[PDB]
Design an enzyme around this catalytic site. Structure first.
Site, PDB file in Angstrom:
ATOM      1  N   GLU A   1      -2.144   3.905  -6.408  1.00  0.00           N
ATOM      2  CA  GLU A   1      -1.295   4.878  -7.092  1.00  0.00           C
ATOM      3  C   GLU A   1       0.135   4.350  -7.234  1.00  0.00           C
ATOM      4  OE1 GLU A   1      -1.693   7.764  -8.613  1.00  0.00           O
ATOM      5  OE2 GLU A   1      -3.851   7.994  -8.306  1.00  0.00           O
ATOM      6  N   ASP A   2       0.242   3.167  -7.828  1.00  0.00           N
ATOM      7  CA  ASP A   2       1.514   2.519  -8.124  1.00  0.00           C
ATOM      8  C   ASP A   2       2.293   2.140  -6.874  1.00  0.00           C
ATOM      9  OD1 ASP A   2       1.123   2.750 -10.925  1.00  0.00           O
ATOM     10  OD2 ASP A   2       1.863   4.815 -10.861  1.00  0.00           O
ATOM     11  N   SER A   3       1.608   1.804  -5.792  1.00  0.00           N
ATOM     12  CA  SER A   3       2.248   1.290  -4.593  1.00  0.00           C
ATOM     13  C   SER A   3       2.064  -0.222  -4.519  1.00  0.00           C
ATOM     14  CB  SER A   3       1.675   1.963  -3.348  1.00  0.00           C
ATOM     15  OG  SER A   3       2.280   1.456  -2.179  1.00  0.00           O
TER      16      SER A   3
ATOM     17  N   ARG B   1      -1.796   1.614 -18.442  1.00  0.00           N
ATOM     18  CA  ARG B   1      -0.508   1.288 -19.039  1.00  0.00           C
ATOM     19  C   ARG B   1      -0.635   0.229 -20.125  1.00  0.00           C
ATOM     20  NH1 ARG B   1       1.490   2.065 -13.725  1.00  0.00           N
ATOM     21  NH2 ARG B   1       1.909   4.305 -13.500  1.00  0.00           N
TER      22      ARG B   1
ATOM     23  N   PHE C   1       2.768   7.244  -6.013  1.00  0.00           N
ATOM     24  CA  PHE C   1       3.573   6.445  -5.093  1.00  0.00           C
ATOM     25  C   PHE C   1       4.429   5.434  -5.855  1.00  0.00           C
ATOM     26  CE2 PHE C   1      -0.419   7.421  -2.707  1.00  0.00           C
ATOM     27  CZ  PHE C   1       0.119   8.473  -2.008  1.00  0.00           C
TER      28      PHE C   1
END
Ligand SMILES: [Mg+2]
Ligand SMILES: [Zn+2]
Ligand SMILES: [Zn+2]
Ligand SMILES: [Zn+2]
Lengths: 49, 257, 477, 64, 192, 48, 44, 115, 98, 35, 40, 240
Positions: free
Chosen positions: C204-206, C375, L159
């Site tokens: 999650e975009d970490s 994206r 996140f």
């Protein structure tokens, strides 16, 4: 008042080469704050005499 | 039910790297050895800096950061050196640390390169590895850097500055007989330097009964330890980790009963 | 048109527009008109010739400059109104070359189509391979990255300043970056980034960062906070001065230690400070004298970098104190590439824990593969592939957007010459177990940026705090 | 601002190669040739010198 | 916990190799786009020669735009399906789409085959200039390239005109996101 | 609705005020359901 | 209490009461001298 | 502000046991070994050595949390073999193997250095 | 004397005008600093360009809500005199009125 | 004679480089204030 | 054709207004015109 | 004037009654933690060491609360205050003398937040019930809030810089309210669409698809490794 009549947030065709098509703040200011393209120049004005 | 009988074949041994092959070993033992190379081999590094004067363009803990990363010769002195925590002195003494001093003043129109050659130790055994030299800071005329630092024992598990390796190449099954990696197109993949396949061949035939063995290593040293010393220290360090665990386990078993 | 191109009577910025249908010629000389330089095309040929380029090559020691191109009539400025009457060629090599006659009346040509982008969009590599909103997101993130904002930052005393220890110029760069001085003052580091799902801490975009790399100064930065305080003598009764308060002299003083303060009431440079410390000791005479000293926020913990004492514009003695605080990357800090791929650090693994290639290379940053598909930031994948060829070849990669000489296949073929998979995939071994990972991981150098948003600047807790007297409700203290 | 002491990725020493690297470039070496001459084989270490910006040089143009 | 630790063995990635397609697949996509452009050209010729009969409920302009859009919409679908069929079992774009974790069929096709038509307020790129979308086209140019049809994929990269029209189409999404944030919870607080 | 050959049962309007003044409050209750359902289910979403 | 002039970098002892100014330069920007106290840095 | 000292990963604080054995009541002849301030370096090597034992029915380890520094090793043995006995024999075999590796690496260094 | 004008840095009337890069470093100024801003009470202030409709140009627009079918406005301004701009509208009344 | 396609990429960026050698990037702000 | 949807249509319903943005009907035919296009 | 004080969005009736700042609340950035349960939130030590819960002194916990008072603010987990039967507050860190710090039944010890404490965790905008769910506190050694990857969907959280609010219920009655009504597991299925609100997500969803393919085969060692992470495992290795 002028901005109400026509929406200026949209990227108009005429911004080509004058205003960066990608750079614009996200949020309430999308499309209202703009940035010059690298070779864009704003005239300083001169007398038409 | 019992231990492996691993064998060692050293392929290359220089002052910078050691290339060797271990055979008749489990993958876990081979991997734990390379983790010890990086994280559990003690060396000596600067872990304490007092800066008496710093007029340079780099702030104080920028300079201290660079000092800690300078490798110091710690081949034989490291074994007999103690950990400051284990040592009973008043936070520092010759038995658990090495003092360093740097006092550079620039009085010339030419830029003064403060290198590791300017780091002076009270122990001849522990000196910067380069003594080209490692640049600490460049000084303009009128700028000075005066500091004293202590180098103490530690291993890479605490900080990367105590890691003695400049790269640990680890490999096994170069021809992928075990199929531990599945290539969507094996023909697109370059051959390993340890590969024993023909030019036409791309993968070894699948070995259903095979096991990971014959692990290839290339331990490159930063300079603090000799590349062979890292491996020997790692084997004794890993052995000490297990012997310590066994000693604690024995007491726990006795307490349970 | 002839007069303007000769610069005889009509200046360069004068725009002449003819509306043929409406039978109107509009000449505009006022200010505020946005225009750009365009190459003049006559008879399907550029007026710009090799002789013009040769003179420009010796720009110095020749006195030949851009103004001679305008004076020579080879290039002219076109505003938006005039652009409506202009038949513009994107490139000379393709548009006005002999071919199927789509158009044979080109009047102008672009110098380069990539000049449509601005300053922040001009650092994006391969921006034409990204989804457009991601180029917009990066233009926002690029202004929040860390680097060296200005060379003389030591002399300056700004309220907030972030300086990266080791800024690097991108391995993959755009031609426009030469004029932004992004090479001279870079904001970021070239990171060995693996696009893999290692342990679930990059989801999650970490981001998973290498702890050993962080220990070596990877993305280490300085934070400078400058505090200004001025003493005002306004009011005969009250006269505030700089001095460390003393218990006997001042009726009321807090239990905070004033040992840090000097006899002039100002803490000396090179002194550790925290919330409990007082940096400025200012005491106001009563109509004993009350103290009005300044305290630091509990969050801040740095070392006094600089203390300057002056008279402000008003002529009052005032001091600026710069506190230095080193910010080592940690969990929760935001990092971003140049393609809108923004994320916090989920966890940091030591070099032994990180997955490694056969050469012993461990990625500095591991990002989740699930960030790409939605994206569609293919430019991020191309930048990593180009950057891998760049680091191995020893040449800075060119990521100018509209370049036909560069494509993924050409970059892939180059990567094969260096003993790597042509698509940038590598066989990674598990750091925890040493076993080969079944999938081959896309790994290579990518330019990442550390953003101003640190978790320490954001973490804050409240538990029975200093309520307001009037409202009897919580407030900051 | 100044060349890092260690390569971030592997910890190899890089702080004693910037001056040699600049000297090699002055000797007409290509950037790749200079890196090979300096022993930088892994592209992680080549990244260190190929992408380094030496701001400490211009910071010294300001008098202390 | 169980599968996060098996993924340590299996591993999952995404890279340039997943964005590529076969040379045969690229040829098929190119043929579809080449034919689709010719189909739009024929529709333009019919309109220019007054041989286009408006459909019920639509004017001639709406009829032409509907016919052109369906041709280009069909082309994107035809190329998108072709690109998806070329994907192997190992492809990581497909694996994330198949599991539903992230992405969709349209994302794969855009990355591999064609980004497609860019629309502003539901229509093709408007003639913001005088009868032109950009100064690089002829006046009254209703072809796919002029009006905002991106014939390239993200892997292949967009041309300068496609890049700008894609930016125009992408600005619409940015504006809508800002509006939704403003509208977020407005109805809820009125109902409550 | 009164027009000949026009279904006086299924014929409806999307204007709630028009429905209220022609059919009644209970017709509005049903019409409001259908309008509220139509917008919610337009994108395929479901609400109990 | 030593203050370094921002113009000529002259170290001059300045009292609290007397005005802040370079004794010989006349400059009006003064920087405090670095503290004589010792602060420890761990090279981490 | 919450950063833990780097030495917390390998140094036992006062009153912390390096290893604790807990019987696993789910299955007979099963024990859980909670080893403090250890990581995959010892968990993986111990676990793999256990699997070589034919009397060990189950052997596995885990780090419950990467931010914490404990490894739990679960060992289930046959009725005639104790999980503690399997653990001790596993460590002795590893020490035997490591000692043998030290000797043979030392011999190899002499061979290469000699010529 | 009639007042003081804030000066945009690195402009013809700035002290850092024509100074070579070495000269700027002597003044503790970054040569890469582009200037183009003002220092107002020590704060570096940048003037954001304000976008406005061109003057002296006849623009014909249509407003549906209003009572005029079409309106041709013209914001007239002198040649650098009388900064205030006077707008004249010439609107055609809507046909809605019955 | 004429700039051939094989030299265009070098040529166009020499023109662009000369433009920023003369104007810079904040020439609009400085020119406006000078006027 | 096009009608209001999403939030603005949801807004209209809760904000019941004498004039919706896009008022419309849905007329159904009960005779032969329903199945006969010409009669419809 | 008096009318002004009440009028406005910031007035007493609206700006100080309907909404207001609250004590015992925390906010920081959120980062992933696949090692936590869905009903568990990782909390920085500083936040936990700053927020306290008042525990009523009972013979059940008289000794345990006595230790926390002795440890005090200096050592975590400790305590900040003591409330006597009189209702008066004693600041521990000022004076740790155990003579003045004897506890007795009816005293309330405001001990530091510890593991297993119930908190309400919220991401704004709070659009539905699953935007304020109850969690069990798990102290972790860095400065972020941790979330299981599954609860990110109900929170609509990512996140990439998101921040979430932590509210600590301060009494047994309100603590039992969160346990029995607002915990995450009780929120798995939403009444809005009578379907689960959180599910399996990116890595676990992509991997479970691969894991369940027909040609995925696990060796003896691999299976024993996966079984170490199956908390509900009964201990019996299945027949291969
Ligand atoms: Mg977010
Ligand atoms: Zn000692
Ligand atoms: Zn390296
Ligand atoms: Zn002076």
């Amino acid at each position: 008042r002028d901005g109400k009549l026509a929406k200026p947030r949209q990227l108009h065709n005429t911004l080509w080469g004058m205003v960066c098509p990608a750079e614009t703040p996200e949020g309430h200011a999308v499309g209202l704050v703009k940035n010059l393209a690298l070779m864009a120049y704003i005239s300083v004005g001169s007398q038409p005499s | 039910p019992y231990a492996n009988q691993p064998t060692v074949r050293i392929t290359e041994l220089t002052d910078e790297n050691v290339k060797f092959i271990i055979e008749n070993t489990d993958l876990a033992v081979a991997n734990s050895i390379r983790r010890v190379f990086i994280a559990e081999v003690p060396i000596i590094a600067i872990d304490w800096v007092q800066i008496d004067a710093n007029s340079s363009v780099l702030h104080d803990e920028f300079i201290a950061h660079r000092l800690g990363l300078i490798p110091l010769t710690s081949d034989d002195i490291v074994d007999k050196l103690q950990y400051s925590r284990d040592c009973t002195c008043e936070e520092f003494c010759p038995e658990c640390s090495v003092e360093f001093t740097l006092d550079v003043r620039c009085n010339e129109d030419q830029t003064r390169h403060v290198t590791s050659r300017d780091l002076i130790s009270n122990s001849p055994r522990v000196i910067p590895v380069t003594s080209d030299d490692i640049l600490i800071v460049k000084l303009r005329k009128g700028q000075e850097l005066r500091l004293r630092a202590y180098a103490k024992k530690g291993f890479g598990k605490e900080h990367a500055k105590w890691n003695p390796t400049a790269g640990v190449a680890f490999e096994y099954d170069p021809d992928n007989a075990l199929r531990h990696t599945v290539y969507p197109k094996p023909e697109e993949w370059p051959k390993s330097e340890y590969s024993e396949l023909d030019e036409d061949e791309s993968q070894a035939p699948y070995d259903p009964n095979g096991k990971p063995e014959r692990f290839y290593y290339n331990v490159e040293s930063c300079g603090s330890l000799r590349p062979e010393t890292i491996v020997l220290s790692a084997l004794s360090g890993l052995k000490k980790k297990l012997s310590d665990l066994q000693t604690q386990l024995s007491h726990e078993i006795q307490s349970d009963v | 048109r002839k007069l303007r191109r000769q610069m005889d009577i009509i200046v360069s910025e004068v725009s002449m527009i003819r509306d043929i249908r409406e039978r109107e010629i509009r000449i505009y000389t006022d200010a505020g008109r946005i225009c750009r330089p365009l190459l003049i095309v006559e008879k399907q040929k550029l007026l710009l010739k090799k002789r013009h380029i040769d003179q420009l090559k010796e720009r110095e020691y020749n006195n030949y400059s851009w103004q001679d191109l305008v004076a020579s009539g080879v290039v002219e400025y076109i505003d938006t109104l005039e652009e409506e009457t202009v038949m513009l060629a994107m490139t000379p090599d393709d548009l006005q070359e002999k071919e199927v006659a789509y158009c044979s009346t080109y009047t102008h040509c672009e110098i380069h189509p990539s000049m449509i982008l601005g300053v922040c969009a001009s650092i994006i590599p391969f921006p034409d391979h990204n989804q457009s909103p991601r180029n917009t997101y990066q233009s926002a993130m690029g202004k929040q990255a860390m680097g060296v904002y200005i060379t003389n930052f030591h002399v300056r005393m700004d309220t907030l300043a972030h300086v990266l220890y080791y800024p690097q110029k991108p391995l993959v760069t755009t031609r426009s970056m030469e004029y932004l001085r992004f090479r001279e003052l870079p904001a970021g580091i070239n990171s060995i980034v693996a696009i893999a799902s290692y342990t679930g801490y990059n989801q999650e975009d970490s981001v998973i960062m290498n702890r050993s790399a962080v220990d070596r100064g990877f993305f280490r930065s300085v934070f400078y906070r400058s505090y200004k305080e001025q003493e005002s003598k306004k009011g005969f009764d009250q006269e505030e001065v700089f001095e460390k308060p003393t218990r006997e002299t001042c009726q009321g003083m807090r239990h905070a230690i004033y040992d840090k303060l000097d006899d002039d009431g100002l803490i000396a440079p090179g002194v550790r400070v925290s919330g409990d410390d007082v940096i400025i000791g200012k005491t106001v005479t009563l109509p004993t004298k009350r103290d009005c000293s300044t305290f630091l926020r509990t969050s801040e913990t740095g070392i006094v970098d600089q203390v300057m004492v002056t008279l402000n514009q008003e002529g009052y003695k005032f001091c600026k104190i710069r506190v230095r605080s080193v910010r080592i990357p940690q969990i929760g800090d935001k990092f971003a590439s140049r393609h809108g791929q923004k994320g916090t650090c989920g966890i940091q693994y030591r070099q032994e824990d990180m997955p490694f290639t056969c050469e012993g290379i461990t990625p500095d940053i591991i990002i989740n593969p699930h960030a790409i598909p939605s994206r569609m930031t293919i430019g991020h994948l191309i930048e990593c592939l180009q950057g891998k060829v760049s680091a191995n070849k020893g040449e800075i990669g060119d990521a100018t957007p509209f370049n036909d000489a560069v494509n993924v296949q050409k970059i892939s073929n180059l990567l094969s010459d260096y003993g790597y998979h042509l698509r940038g995939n590598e066989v990674l071994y598990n750091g925890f177990t040493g076993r080969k990972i079944t999938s081959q991981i896309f790994i290579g150098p990518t330019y990442y940026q550390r953003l101003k948003h640190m978790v320490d600047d954001k973490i804050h807790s409240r538990a029975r705090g200093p309520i307001q007297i009037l409202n009897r409700q919580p407030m900051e203290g | 601002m100044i060349i890092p002491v260690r390569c971030f990725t592997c910890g190899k020493i890089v702080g004693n190669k910037w001056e040699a690297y600049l000297g090699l470039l002055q000797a007409e070496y290509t950037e790749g040739d200079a890196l090979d001459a300096l022993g930088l084989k892994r592209y992680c270490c080549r990244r260190m010198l190929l992408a380094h910006v030496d701001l400490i040089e211009k910071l010294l143009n300001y008098a202390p | 916990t169980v599968i996060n630790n098996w993924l340590l063995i299996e591993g999952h990635t995404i890279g340039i190799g997943d964005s590529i397609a076969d040379s045969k697949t690229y040829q098929d996509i190119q043929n579809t786009i080449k034919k689709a452009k010719q189909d739009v050209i024929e529709v333009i010729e019919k309109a220019h020669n007054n041989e286009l009969e408006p459909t019920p409920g639509n004017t001639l302009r709406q009829t032409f735009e509907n016919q052109v859009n369906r041709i280009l919409n069909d082309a994107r679908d035809k190329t998108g399906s072709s690109a998806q069929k070329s994907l192997s079992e190992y492809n990581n774009f497909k694996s994330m789409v198949v599991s539903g974790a992230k992405g969709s069929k349209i994302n794969i096709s855009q990355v591999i085959a064609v980004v497609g038509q860019q629309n502003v307020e539901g229509k093709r790129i408007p003639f913001g200039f005088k009868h032109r979308t950009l100064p690089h086209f002829i006046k009254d140019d209703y072809g796919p390239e002029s009006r905002g049809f991106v014939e390239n994929s993200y892997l292949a990269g967009l041309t300068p005109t496609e890049f700008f029209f894609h930016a125009m189409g992408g600005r619409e999404g940015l504006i809508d996101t800002a509006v939704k944030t403003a509208e977020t919870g407005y109805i809820q607080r009125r109902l409550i | 609705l009164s027009e000949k050959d026009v279904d006086p049962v299924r014929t409806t309007s999307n204007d709630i005020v028009e429905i209220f003044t022609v059919l009644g409050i209970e017709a509005v209750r049903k019409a409001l359901e259908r309008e509220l359902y139509h917008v919610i289910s337009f994108d395929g979403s479901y609400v109990n | 209490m030593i203050y370094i002039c921002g113009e000529c970098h002259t170290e001059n002892e300045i009292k609290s009461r007397d005005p802040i100014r370079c004794r010989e330069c006349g400059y009006r920007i003064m920087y405090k001298k670095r503290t004589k106290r010792l602060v420890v840095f761990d090279a981490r | 502000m919450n950063a833990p000292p780097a030495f917390e990963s390998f140094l036992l604080f006062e009153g912390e046991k390096k290893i604790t054995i807990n019987k696993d009541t789910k299955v007979p002849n099963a024990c859980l070994f909670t080893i403090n301030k250890e990581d995959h370096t010892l968990g993986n090597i111990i676990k793999s050595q256990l699997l070589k034992d034919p009397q060990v029915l189950f052997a596995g380890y885990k780090v419950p949390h990467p931010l914490e520094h404990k490894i739990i090793i679960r060992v289930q043995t046959t009725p005639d073999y104790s999980p503690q006995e399997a653990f001790t024999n596993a460590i002795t075999d590893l020490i035997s193997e490591l000692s043998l590796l030290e000797e043979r690496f030392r011999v190899a260094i002499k061979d290469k250095q000699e010529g | 004397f009639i007042g003081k004008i804030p000066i945009m840095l690195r402009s013809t009337y700035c002290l850092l005008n024509g100074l070579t890069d070495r000269d700027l470093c002597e003044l503790n100024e970054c040569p890469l600093d582009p200037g183009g801003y003002f220092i107002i009470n020590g704060s570096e202030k940048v003037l954001i360009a304000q976008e406005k409709m061109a003057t002296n140009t006849v623009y014909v627009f249509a407003k549906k809500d209003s009572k005029y079918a079409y309106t041709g406005e013209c914001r007239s301004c002198l040649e650098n005199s009388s900064r205030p701009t006077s707008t004249i509208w010439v609107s055609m009344l809507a046909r809605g009125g019955q | 004679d004429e700039i051939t396609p094989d030299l265009w990429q070098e040529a166009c960026w020499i023109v662009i480089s000369s433009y920023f050698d003369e104007k810079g990037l904040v020439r609009q702000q400085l020119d406006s204030f000078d006027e | 054709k096009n009608v209001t949807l999403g939030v603005p249509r949801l807004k209209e319903l809760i904000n019941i207004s004498k004039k919706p943005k896009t008022p419309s009907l849905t007329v159904f035919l009960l005779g032969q015109s329903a199945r006969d296009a010409e009669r419809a | 004037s008096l009318k002004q004080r009440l009028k406005g969005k910031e007035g007493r009736v609206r700006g100080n009654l309907m909404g207001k700042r609250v004590d015992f609340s925390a906010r920081t950035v959120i980062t992933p933690d696949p090692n936590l349960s869905i009903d568990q939130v990782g909390v920085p030590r500083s936040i936990a060491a700053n927020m306290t819960f008042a525990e009523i002194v009972t013979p059940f916990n008289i000794d345990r609360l006595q230790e926390l008072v002795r440890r005090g603010n200096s050592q975590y987990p400790g305590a900040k205050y003591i409330i006597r039967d009189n209702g008066d507050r004693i600041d521990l860190r000022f004076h740790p003398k155990p003579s003045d710090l004897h506890l007795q039944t009816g005293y309330k010890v405001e001990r530091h937040m510890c593991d297993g404490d119930i908190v309400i965790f919220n991401r704004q905008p709070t659009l539905h019930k699953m935007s304020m769910m109850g969690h069990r506190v798990r102290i972790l050694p860095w400065s972020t809030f941790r979330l299981n990857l599954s609860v990110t969907t109900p929170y609509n959280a990512d996140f990439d810089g998101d921040e979430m609010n932590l509210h600590l219920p301060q009494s047994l009655e309100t603590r039992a309210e969160i346990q029995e009504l607002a915990m995450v597991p009780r929120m798995i299925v939403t009444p809005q669409s009578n379907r689960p609100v959180m599910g399996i997500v990116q890595d676990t969803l992509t991997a479970v698809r691969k894991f369940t393919k027909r040609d995925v085969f696990l060796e003896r060692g691999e299976v024993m490794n996966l079984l170490m992470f199956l908390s509900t495992w009964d201990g019996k290795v299945p027949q291969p």
